[PDB]
Amino acid sequence: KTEWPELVGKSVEEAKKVILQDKPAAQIIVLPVGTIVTMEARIDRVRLFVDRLDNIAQVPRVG
Amino acid sequence: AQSVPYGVSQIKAPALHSQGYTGSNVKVAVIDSGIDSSHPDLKVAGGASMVPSETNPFQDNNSHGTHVAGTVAALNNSIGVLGVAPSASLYAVKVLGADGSGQYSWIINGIEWAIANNMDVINMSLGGPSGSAALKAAVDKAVASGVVVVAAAGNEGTSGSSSTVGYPGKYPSVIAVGAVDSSNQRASFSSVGPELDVMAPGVSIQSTLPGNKYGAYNGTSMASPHVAGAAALILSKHPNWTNTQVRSSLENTTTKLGDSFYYGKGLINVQAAAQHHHHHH
Ligand SMILES: [Ca+2]
Ligand code: NA
């Protein structure tokens, strides 16, 4: 599993929990949706882009 | 002893170095997380930070900007790696914080700094899935002002027949760069779409890292500075060429690979780009 479309609209807390069940060694970083980010590929990383209410606003994916 | 990373050889940068051209006097802004100016394999000529809480552009708290910078311009000496354009004047334009992210206004402020300080080339190994009018205006302005603007195409992989190139790479004025490996195969993460312009090495790319280290990174972030460095090599051999001409020289002399949806025009070849007469190999 490398993408979690079912997590869009969920809390960032639930997203971290679910992602760590599927990928326990994931390096999760929470960032504001609508920011610009580095374009290196990290297979250990899952960025979580959140709206101003701390709900997931973009499909989480490994990278 | 110095090592020449495979990607520098793959884009045929050593052919320009042997002709005597290494990017001297060409000003390249690495608009990124900073550049560790204490690294002995880098020489940083200047810069500025647009990150409110990290005001020193010569401190790279992420590592990404320093790696990108080394692919552009790691020094030609007896250590570490060799850069594509090892004599280029390198500027640290810090618009990303430690966590790898920046607000659109920080990126735009960095592009404006680059324009105001007469940069010849901008590299943006960065992206996001949406654009903004202000972001498009900044890149268009840089291009109108004569700057070669190069960006990572993005690491979004494929999505059926949809484009997955991110911004600012997706804007027509910006050269969007995808990633291939040492066998010229597109990396599985490399973004796709009609906005993909050219490809460069983006798999297992050795470069400089903060605290006098080196290491292999993957990404269209790694591919972009091969093309920004190539632009600097071209300009050092043809200092009157416009950005229009530099861009066309790179596009018109790629080694064609697969379908342009996945590969754009193919792999850049800076040897061929820097000749007067251009054709694909
Ligand atoms: Ca060196
Ligand atoms: Na573009």
Query: For residues B97 and B131, what is the distance between their CA atoms, to the nearest angstrom?
Result: 20
Please, which experimental method was used?
A: X-ray
Give the domain range for residue B156. Answer: 1-281
CA distance between the termini of chain B: 32
* Angle at which helices B133-144 and B104-116 cross, to 10°: 10
Within chain B, strands assigned E span 27-32, 44-49, 89-94, 101-102, 121-124, 126-127, 148-152, 175-180, 198-201, 205-209, 213-217
Asked if A36 lies within 8 A of B224 by C-beta distance, the reply is no
Q: With breaks defined as C to next N over 2.5 Å, after which residues does chain B break?
A: none
Q: Does the distance separating the beta carbons of A58 and B62 come in below 8 Å?
A: no
Are residues B22 and B85 in contact, defined by beta-carbon separation less than 8 angstroms? Answer: yes
**Searching chain B, which residue's CA lies closest to the CA of residue A38?**
B126
Cβ distance A17 to A46 under 8 Å?
Answer: no
Closest CA to B231 of B10, B2, B13: B13
Cβ pair A31:B99 closer than 8 A: yes
The domain that holds B42 is classified in CATH as 3.40.50.200
The residues, any chain, with a CB within 8 Å of residue B160's CB and separated by 6 or more, are: none
* C-alpha to C-alpha distance for B126 and B221, rounded to whole angstroms: 7
* Alpha-carbon gap, residue B255 to B270, rounded angstroms: 11
**Considering every ligand atom, which ligand is closest to the CA of B77?**
1
Considering every ligand atom shown, identify the ligand nearest to the alpha carbon of residue B264 and give its number. Answer: 2
For residue B11, report the distance from its CA to the centre of ligand 1, in Å.
18
CATH architecture, domain defined by A1-63:
2-Layer Sandwich (3.30)
The answer to whether A36 contacts B101, with C-beta atoms less than 8 Å apart, is yes
CA nearest to B101 within chain A: A37
Domains in chain B, number: 1
CA of A9 to the centre of ligand 1 (A): 48
Residue of chain A nearest B167, judged by CA positions:
A36
Q: Look up residue B189 and give its two tokens.
A: 């993460």
Identify which of B101, B129, B189 has the shortest CB distance to residue A58.
Answer: B129
Q: How does strand A36-38 pair with strand B126-127?
A: antiparallel
| Distance of alpha carbon B269 from the chain centroid | 15
Contact B108, B135 (CB under 8 A): yes
Residue B267 burial (10 A CB sphere; 0-12, 13-18, 19+) = buried
The one catalytic residue in B17, B64, B67, B226 is B64
Question: Resolution to 1 decimal, in Å?
Answer: 1.7
Closest in B126, B167, B187 to A38, CB measured: B126
Question: Are A36 and B130 an interchain contact pair (Cβ–Cβ within 8 Å)?
Answer: no
C-alpha distance from residue A32 to each of A12, B94, B100, B125 (Å): 11, 19, 12, 19
Residue of A35, A36, A40 lying closest to B219 (CB–CB): A40
B123 touches chain A (CB under 8 A): no
User: How far B26 CA sits from the closest chain A CA (Å)?
Assistant: 24
For residue B154, the chain A residues in CB contact (below 8 A) are: 39
